[PDB]
Design an enzyme around this catalytic site. Structure first.
Site, PDB file in Angstrom:
ATOM      1  CG  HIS A  20      -1.774  -0.963   1.582  1.00 58.63           C
ATOM      2  ND1 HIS A  20      -1.487  -2.121   2.265  1.00 58.63           N
ATOM      3  CD2 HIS A  20      -3.114  -0.991   1.344  1.00 58.63           C
ATOM      4  CE1 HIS A  20      -2.597  -2.819   2.446  1.00 58.63           C
ATOM      5  NE2 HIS A  20      -3.595  -2.150   1.891  1.00 58.63           N
ATOM      6  CG  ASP A  77       1.879  -1.135   3.670  1.00 54.93           C
ATOM      7  OD1 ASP A  77       1.321  -0.924   4.773  1.00 54.93           O
ATOM      8  OD2 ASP A  77       1.423  -1.849   2.760  1.00 54.93           O
ATOM      9  CG  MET A  86      -1.768  -6.069  -6.493  1.00 52.86           C
ATOM     10  SD  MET A  86      -1.703  -5.399  -4.783  1.00 52.86           S
ATOM     11  CE  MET A  86      -2.003  -6.940  -3.829  1.00 52.86           C
ATOM     12  CD  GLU A 113      -8.673  -7.600  -0.748  1.00 49.14           C
ATOM     13  OE1 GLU A 113      -7.687  -6.965  -1.187  1.00 49.14           O
ATOM     14  OE2 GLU A 113      -8.684  -8.194   0.343  1.00 49.14           O
ATOM     15  CE  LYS A 163     -12.941  -7.468   6.326  1.00 49.02           C
ATOM     16  NZ  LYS A 163     -11.815  -6.844   7.122  1.00 49.02           N
ATOM     17  CD  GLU A 170      -8.311 -11.360   2.601  1.00 53.03           C
ATOM     18  OE1 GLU A 170      -7.647 -10.409   2.192  1.00 53.03           O
ATOM     19  OE2 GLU A 170      -8.707 -11.470   3.777  1.00 53.03           O
ATOM     20  CG  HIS A 226     -12.088 -10.391   2.691  1.00 55.24           C
ATOM     21  ND1 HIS A 226     -11.583  -9.305   2.051  1.00 55.24           N
ATOM     22  CD2 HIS A 226     -11.401 -10.464   3.876  1.00 55.24           C
ATOM     23  CE1 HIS A 226     -10.654  -8.753   2.837  1.00 55.24           C
ATOM     24  NE2 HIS A 226     -10.516  -9.446   3.958  1.00 55.24           N
ATOM     25  CG  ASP A 252      -5.602 -10.749  -1.360  1.00 53.84           C
ATOM     26  OD1 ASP A 252      -4.695 -10.595  -2.215  1.00 53.84           O
ATOM     27  OD2 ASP A 252      -6.089  -9.783  -0.737  1.00 53.84           O
ATOM     28  CG  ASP A 275     -10.336 -10.277   7.491  1.00 55.03           C
ATOM     29  OD1 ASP A 275     -10.345 -11.422   7.039  1.00 55.03           O
ATOM     30  OD2 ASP A 275      -9.642  -9.390   6.985  1.00 55.03           O
ATOM     31  CG  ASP A 325      -6.468 -11.066   7.403  1.00 54.72           C
ATOM     32  OD1 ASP A 325      -7.242 -11.394   6.469  1.00 54.72           O
ATOM     33  OD2 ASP A 325      -6.392  -9.902   7.828  1.00 54.72           O
ATOM     34  CG  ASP A 336      -4.354  -9.511   2.593  1.00 58.50           C
ATOM     35  OD1 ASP A 336      -3.763  -9.155   3.637  1.00 58.50           O
ATOM     36  OD2 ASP A 336      -5.229  -8.813   2.064  1.00 58.50           O
TER      37      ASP A 336
HETATM   38 CO   LIG Z   1      -6.845  -9.113   0.914  1.00 60.99          CO
HETATM   39 CO   LIG Z   2      -8.497 -10.052   5.400  1.00 55.04          CO
END
Ligand SMILES: [Co+2]
Ligand SMILES: [Co+2]
Ligand SMILES: [Co+2]
Ligand SMILES: [Co+2]
Ligand SMILES: [Co+2]
Ligand SMILES: [Co+2]
Ligand SMILES: [Co+2]
Ligand SMILES: [Co+2]
Lengths: 387, 387, 387, 387
Positions: free
Chosen positions: A53, A56, A87, A180, A182, A216, A219, A244, A254, A256, A286
């Site tokens: 991102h 980041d 990406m 993406e 969610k 993802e 998600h 993802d 979430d 992850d 991710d």
């Molecule tokens: Co993701």
């Molecule tokens: Co997530």
């Protein structure tokens, strides 16, 4: 054994292994990771590339001078390792200004800023070689009904994506967008909550060909949906631009978790599908190393993501190659499913007495589908109690 | 008070008030209702019309002779009451032959029969005046991963809908199709599980204009999604062809409670949306009077569906008409949401220093959204602790 | 109108109105609130008292000198407003040291520290007048299977609670403990996930009489359970020592919406139960003003919590007092429910031919329960379309 | 390979393999199975015994003559095969008379009949050798708030169970009761929805020692709870009298998939727990062969249940025996978890400066839990990519 190499296309976002562990009820448990250091360590693990991102890589609010310094150190590490950046994405959810969204914030000035912040990072992404630009509208949505008129917010969302499409085409960039989805978190309900909603929205954009989805695992599972089913639809539509991978243990926040964890059988069916469909994009992870872990745990978690994909890939392949399974697929009529229902056409079908007038529903109903034997063969293969 | 009349457009399927109460763990608690009797009673309650699956009106397997007899008695009641039949649908889920689906059953002969059974009922629907033909693929899906290749099943689903589209156009019928999504039950996972998935699928059909969705309150809620949000997207796309109203108390088996029950605030936001968007189609109630009820309970339940819509309609209207609410909407910037983000265009936006270079994210972030005051005004209105 | 007064017993935790808005994906949107200021503003709103975690009042790691200073300022505000402190709790979840729990952390020294930190705040709580000491083991649990042996973890949980029971009794304090259940978040799965689990656990402690539950509306709904039913079981067992009121829109992350929001019908059934059962403890609001809000919004959201309780209280009382509803309750046999099944005894029941040999299940089955008419009356009362 | 033998203790209910496939939206797909035939086929598969509801064995309403005939044929088959009947239960959910429950129906005569019907089957159960009598109150609960006063319903539930306790003791039977929890379906919400609720309720009965729980994998997962954790709490309390094994793919209708399907990692953690805790009761499979299957599929599905338990048993044992895992458990401090927190006592803990005054939370927080490496080892063992 199962040792990953760059050919395997495993990528990681800087924010995954770099997650410091701050959750809604607690402080960071790990120190920050320099992007350059993550790149070198991931290369050592067999990763293919990294994603980021804007925030980041470059601290929010950093001067043009500091910004160039940060990008330089990162590029140095990429150059030394041969790691790719397939990406990139924009952070339109962390700063307080995005509290009601970025592209659909009620405040117009915030929407303008959001687009500008995005366009700035698209330039950088292209410069680094990214082929896909992801958009996760984490803040697009609401907690209460009147706070957001959804039809008009969709107008604003379409406007934003169309403007990005115009930008990219005017600049001659060879980069595509992937939305993406969610369902909820951090907003009570997020707009374009699932793969289907995102896919439908895309067909209403001015240049639909420039957009796809970046689903993802965790998600879709947050809505209790079947991920492999959703991936199939995205594939059938030709819109799986990126993906993802992670794990999720059901309908809740979430998680992850690293790939493989969470719904294991779903991971197996997902891998079987990606490999059989011949998906050629990155296998992006991710995920978030749990906050109970130190740095050694972080790297073990990241390694686990890739290992699990490799083991699952082998089991899926063994499953499909087994003659006993091919026999079971024929017994369940997977071959008949591929035949056109009416290749003879509508008029022939209507005149076909065996299709209705003389059809015997009871006799046809008597035929067992033989699905359980097939599924148990799949289980055997997954548990390695066979190939 | 709130007394319904045919102008209110409330419709009911024969299978709703006619449900005998058989559930997976128990036998019927009520006797069967003659279709003609339901029509007359619903007319007395102020209903606008009725809907039916072929098998609710004509017993499966009935001869052409018995079939005509059944249709005659039904038409007689429609004629005497002036009740309309705005929608009809096919039962492709009850008979054992449809155990693996109708349009996507692995067995080809079953897929052919399914299309024939459907086309036969489309003819009847048109004859009775139906403007919308619903398709709920209750049996399209799977309980195990290899039992169904989803990409090929979507090919079969597209083939079936395209064939129906060709039929309707060749016959010159003025009837449209509406796909009714459901995430799971009776299959482990059902294909086209949500509004979004159905909407995306439609855009891949040969004549997309002939198809829309018939979302059901309880179904989207089975995936934990926001129904009013999904309805907004369907409306934004111009695809809300019909709609099923009922209630659901969360993520569990499909309850089909009477409208109003289940998520009350969602019912309020749904009504506010339908009325404000000017939806003109039927307000169809696909609900099931609980099996604890006798016939008096059945009619009380049906009456309750309409009453609740009427009360909610009044509260929604009072809410939107209140000057204090209009003031609160302005305070929350719902008006700014309607302004184009960049009516000045891409080039102007890029050259706009106030959009980025000179933008102050901290000052903008300091602005409260005033969403809670607005939501409490909405609550007050719903509870009638104000208009 | 519905104005709250201290007699209503509404309390708020300092962390509720003081929540700065940091969520897993975003930075704080509001500046910190001084505990003294919150106390004064809550008093102005008509609140009865406040509650606090040790860390809300005294910064983690503050010296004995700074600690006394913080306590002094807080007490000054309480003294000036007459605000009470009915409940207090310990923060055993924010600091990284509690990453694997407090009472059930794998590391023994952390478990010891957790007990000492708790005991220190129990002394303070008693000094301030608290009658209930709440324990929410938000970090007790796991994300993976082998990380925690649950049977032994329960042994450690019992040991900790038993030690606390011993301390409280040795000091002669008049304070009781209340366990606050939550199914997940921040841990993948949290120990004692629901009201039932906590109730069962309590009966295995050395002095069960000292412990009860402090259920939270949103937490039980995170498991898709019926909150009013759960509260009834806790009331039936004599264990409802305290209660947290808020709102939740389904199975997803813990939202902590203001009371009334989320499941509105549940909120009505809960108020109906609390008022009819004569619950005399605090009506504590453990909620979070959405991060989209500024300070005016915070106070509006907090006022909303009390307003909604008051409106619901009025409608529930109106519902129960209505003669038409009393008639409806008799029709549905709520009165027969209260008659003992076999007041005549086992022996008499066995000899009773009308209870089996001569019982006609078909005739009895024919009786409608009349539950729908009753529920519609309940709806009419809630919406104020009747008293 | 993994061949089951009676020593494995696998049992099946007659209603499992005998399920005809009728679901809420479809007719039966398989003809009925004679109880005698099921017993013989299950014996051939290596099952240890069978279980039954009274109505599975004897048709509802059959005369004393027909009843004896049915029992005779069943006993003949048991005698010839050596098959045991470890558990029996009553059907208090199928007949319309139980539409509002058995033990907690509002109608007093229905509650009396429910008790008599149960007592009659308890006599039969004891005669056949059953050691556990299961009670699943699938109809105890409600769809609306006022239809059931839960506190009084709990009074009626206690009364019924207490009466059963009295009967069993008066007759001198050596049989125990086990309550089977389920959150919802067929009722909107079912009383005693989870293991925790049932455990808590039991401690309020007159003779708590006579009752325990019979949890079902899929039922707890319908609430999104962790089954292995719940089983651990029931083991910790000494209340795991029996257990139902099956599979569930998330929060939705009760699927009753064969064991191993659904959440596979949970199935592994459950087997690991049952085997390490030394549970000696039956491994009962309460599942339903999907209605897509014919009789060959039914038997394949039933064989699958046992096969998966056996494979999982092997991998769990391999996991625990592995020296590398024992090292990993020590690194994650599972051994420290077993040490009492304060074996030295409350007074010593209070005087301990290293437990608070001189404790360094930052140093201790720095220690990684090493949970990810441990979980990956667990994954490797499950997939057979290691022992
Ligand atoms: Co993701
Ligand atoms: Co997530
Ligand atoms: Co439905
Ligand atoms: Co419907
Ligand atoms: Co909460
Ligand atoms: Co709380
Ligand atoms: Co079940
Ligand atoms: Co069971």
């Amino acid at each position: 054994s199962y040792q990953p190499t760059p050919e395997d296309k495993f990528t990681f976002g800087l924010w995954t292994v770099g997650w410091q562990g701050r959750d809604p009820f607690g402080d960071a448990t790990r120190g920050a990771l320099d992007p350059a250091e993550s790149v070198r360590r991931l290369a050592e693990l067999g990763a293919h590339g990294v994603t980021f991102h804007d925030d980041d890589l470059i601290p929010f609010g950093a001067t043009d001078s500091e910004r160039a310094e940060h990008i330089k150190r990162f590029r140095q590490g990429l150059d030394e390792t041969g790691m790719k950046v397939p990406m990139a994405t924009t952070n339109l959810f962390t700063h307080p200004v995005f509290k009601d969204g970025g592209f659909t914030a009620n405040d117009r000035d915030v929407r303008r800023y959001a687009l500008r912040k995005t366009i700035r990072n698209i330039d950088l992404a292209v410069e680094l070689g990214a082929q896909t630009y992801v958009a996760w509208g984490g803040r697009e949505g609401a907690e209460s009904g009147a706070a957001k008129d959804v039809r008009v917010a969709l107008d604003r969302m379409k406007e934003a994506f169309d403007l990005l499409g115009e930008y990219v085409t005017s600049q001659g960039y060879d980069t595509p967008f992937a939305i993406e989805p969610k369902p909820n978190e951090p907003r009570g309900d997020i707009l374009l909550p699932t793969i289907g909603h995102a896919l439908a929205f895309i067909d209403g954009l001015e240049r639909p060909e420039l957009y796809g989805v970046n689903p993802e695992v965790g998600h879709e599972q947050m809505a209790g949906l079947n991920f492999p089913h959703g991936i199939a639809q995205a594939l059938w539509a030709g819109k799986l631009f990126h993906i993802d991978l992670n794990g999720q243990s059901g309908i809740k926040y979430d998680q992850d978790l690293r790939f493989g964890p969470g719904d294991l059988r779903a991971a197996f069916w997902l891998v079987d599908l990606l490999e059989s469909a011949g998906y050629e994009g990155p296998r992006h992870f991710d995920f978030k190393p749990p906050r109970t872990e130190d740095f050694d745990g972080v790297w073990a978690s990241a390694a686990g993501c890739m290992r699990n994909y490799l083991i699952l890939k082998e089991r899926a392949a063994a499953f499909r190659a087994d003659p006993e399974v091919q026999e079971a697929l024929r017994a369940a009529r997977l071959d008949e499913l591929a035949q056109p229902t009416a290749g003879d056409g509508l008029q022939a079908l209507l005149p076909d007495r065996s299709a209705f007038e003389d059809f015997d529903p009871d006799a046809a109903a008597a035929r067992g589908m033989a699905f359980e034997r097939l599924d148990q063969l799949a289980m055997d293969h997954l548990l390695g109690a066979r190939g």
